[PDB]
Design a protein around this ligand. Sequence first.
Ligand SMILES: [Mg+2]
Ligand SMILES: [Mg+2]
Ligand SMILES: [Mg+2]
Ligand SMILES: [Mg+2]
Lengths: 10, 10, 234, 234
Amino acid sequence: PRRNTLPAMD
Amino acid sequence: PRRNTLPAMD
Amino acid sequence: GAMGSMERASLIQKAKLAEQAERYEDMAAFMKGAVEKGEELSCEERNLLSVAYKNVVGGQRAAWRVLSSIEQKSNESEEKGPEVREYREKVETELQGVCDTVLGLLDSHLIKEAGDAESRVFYLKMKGDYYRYLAEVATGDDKKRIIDSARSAYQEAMDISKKEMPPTNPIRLGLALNFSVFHYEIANSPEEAISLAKTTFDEAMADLHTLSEDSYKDSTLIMQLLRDNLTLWT
Amino acid sequence: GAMGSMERASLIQKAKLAEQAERYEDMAAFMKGAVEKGEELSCEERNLLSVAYKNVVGGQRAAWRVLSSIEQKSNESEEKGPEVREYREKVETELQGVCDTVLGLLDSHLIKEAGDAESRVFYLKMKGDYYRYLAEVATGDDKKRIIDSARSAYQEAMDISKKEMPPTNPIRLGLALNFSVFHYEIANSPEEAISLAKTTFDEAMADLHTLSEDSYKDSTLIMQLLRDNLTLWT
Ligand SMILES: [Mg+2]
Ligand SMILES: [Mg+2]
Ligand SMILES: [Mg+2]
Ligand SMILES: [Mg+2]
């Protein structure tokens, strides 16, 4: 589970 | 469901 | 050849790194440079060449089908101008360029040096496959000739594999799967498509007893793709 | 500018076709050409520019991380030669080139013309993001300067969004999520990372009552990404 950033890849 | 051919995409 | 100054062994190592990185354009360019060194390709190296170009052309075919679909829906409808057609043409031209690159590699000079059943059948399959991708987008006066260039390569591959390889050979099963689909969706021959896949499935089933556990897994994996197509078509 | 002869409206239409086709390199090149027309970008057009480059740089970052990992494992180990390092450098140079392209677009001249909160905060966020991707691969004497160029852009964006946008604004929440991650994994400031995400989450939660059902979904979607990071870090 990688931490989130925006926007996300397709 | 698409018919199969080889090789397949990743 | 931008790869002419790199070592063949470094080109092969970097194709494998590029697969692991999912960089298939780099993978294809590395394998193109390796082939242009002029030496025959090993079994593993053939798979790397095939895998690399199949992922590149696969992205272009998916893109082409999405744009062809939008373009058809806009020809049924509010005019939006030429943009859909122009972009579908640009992608299509790129796709044809990749198919021509692979066909040029097979013609200069992989096929004429392939003396073994497994190498020659492998390249003849690739030739049929990349003429088939050209045929998927062809509309002009050369469509019939393109289809026949696919059929001819597929047939010569089928003749050799029938004489030289067991019915369970993975390259032979992959060739028959693909040739079957050619009959179904390119040549308008769905009965031929169905007949070749049943016959291929049945003959390999009878040969499974001769196989090791790993060969058994390899072969049955491809028989399941044959069965899936038949379930879809019947 | 290879796109200089196409209409701005055709460049925008083809960026949307290229998204639907999953052709993000084409998408980015189309949006690059649109920006170079010199007109301000609309809200939708900003999203297309961001989406396009994020998918391109995302493929390169994933590839870079795989090669950096193989390269480290080979420096722990049987020497394989320079191929892993050379290929990781080539990808890295391509990645830095994409980040420099985006930063050049923001600097010439999107940021100086962005007078509205939503446009200026959006571009300042992008500036921080693309300095952050440069910082992910930087090792030399400019790493500290790169990190500070990210921090500085992120901070100016944070100051404007605090003065000009509600705590639930999706661009404000996205900015705080990304700025938080910068603290965590770039600036070695995991407590700052955690504090900004809790504070962002809490202030938006208190503002949710002012929102329509669609705005509510937009905002709560991004609050869930903030909560996931905090669950991962605590
Ligand atoms: Mg070279
Ligand atoms: Mg019948
Ligand atoms: Mg032009
Ligand atoms: Mg603490």
